């Protein structure tokens with residue numbers, strides 16, 4: 001129950017203690033899952049405040065004028081928002097092996113792959129508006145077109161992951177939307193992208209991914225409530 | 239006439255010579271102007287190939303599957319696309335003073351300001367669809383709302399530029415859309431953002447900005463042709 005979200009009327013939280021960083025998150029948010037994957041991969045000590053996105057604390061707009069999660073806050077009071085920005089900040093500001101390559105071109109390549117991926121999150125949006133079997137057929141084709149872009153990268157690189165044989169930043173940035181494909185009944189969208197399908201299996205074996213994976217039933221529970229603007233959606237299961 | 243664009247039927251260009259980097263550009267493209275501002279600011283030796291965006295060379299899709307400018311190609315044959323990615327690559331891969339700060343938080347701040355700016359380019363799109371004085375009134379209000387986000391940054395920082403008292407990466411990334419405000423008759427959109435208006439004047443004084451500024455009449459010439467899918471638009475004046 002420590003994971004229960006803070007919503008409208010909640011007290012503004014106190015300062016982040018020295019030695020920790022804080023993430024403002026939501027347990028079912030794929031953008032915030034990026035940040036949490038990086039926190040875990042790098043072994044960064046942190047605390048989590050979940051935000052009720054359907055009933056937000058007024059004070060949360062002081063953390064991020066956009067009112068979105070994720071947001072990082074450190075002990076110096078610095079605030080960083082936008083998931084990709086938070087992930088890049090964590091990789092740069094904390095020790096351990098880098099998730100981003102040092103080489104400028106290879107770093108640019110990871111960013112270009114993120115661009116290739118970048119239509120997917122909004123499509124997991126087209127999904128909400130799909131209301132029947134005709135819409136569903138069209139939706140699957142939209143996903144297949146984007147997945148083909150990604151398949152081509154793996155085809156030429158012939159590597160296990162998008163940045164090489166070792167899992168790296170770009171894999172964690174795109175993973176949360178693939179995690180949810182099964183629950184969305186879009187897992188057939190990778191049947192004509194065989195390397196991408198194998199990549200999904202390799203990702204599920206990663207210790208960091210595995211530790212943060214949410215079950216289909218749990219995400220289903222969240223989605224049913226979320227689609228109705230339920231103030232209880234973010235706290236599903238608690 | 240060396241600046242004349244390459245279009246459909248043109249021969250694929252040869253390798254980039256050692257010691258130079260090549261940009262695939264278009265003289266009136268604000269995204270490519272970002273890259274060219276960085277090339278100039280850092281004193282990077284380069285060549286330019288302008289692409290006829292209304293009559294593209296087929297081979298250009300081998301440089302960028304998206305078929306957009308800008309694109310960088312170096313002597314090793316590496317290809318980098320997306321303007322922000324090209325700019326970050328240049329800052330990292332070439333010597334001279336950095337345009338991006340070394341500090342991870344301050345770098346993240348520049349990226350967050352880019353996010354605050356990020357609706358503007360599409361609005362210079364809403365502008366195309368504005369066909370009368372009513373549309374124009376609505377368009378100006380859209381710009382004013384976004385400019386207020388930027389004004390707030392300057393208000394708290396109380397610095398000459400968005401990254402400090404010295405011009406830096408973020409200023410060059412947002413400048414090309416402000417350059418064009420006069421020609422679009424949107425220069426009144428900054429009259430209630432006084433620090434932003436002063437920033438525009440400071441930018442025009444910058445040696446790099448000044449060297450690459452295009453006159454209103456020239457951009458007007460381009461726009462008139464561009465709005466009709468003219469194969470001659472990109473080569474206006476040549």
Ligand SMILES: N[C@@H](CCC(=O)N[C@@H](CS)C(=O)NCC(=O)O)C(=O)O
Nearest residue numbers: 029030031053068069070082083084
């Ligand atoms: N571009 C943002 C998107 C973040 C985002 O959209 N987060 C959602 C939850 S997964 C949110 O906070 N939604 C609340 C809202 O839209 O009001 C990022 O990359 O961090």
Ligand SMILES: N[C@@H](CCC(=O)N[C@@H](CS)C(=O)NCC(=O)O)C(=O)O
Nearest residue numbers: 267268269291306307308320321322
């Ligand atoms: N997101 C790209 C946008 C680049 C872009 O849109 N460039 C335009 C010209 S300013 C282009 O190439 N247009 C050709 C087209 O749309 O087909 C970037 O940041 O580089």
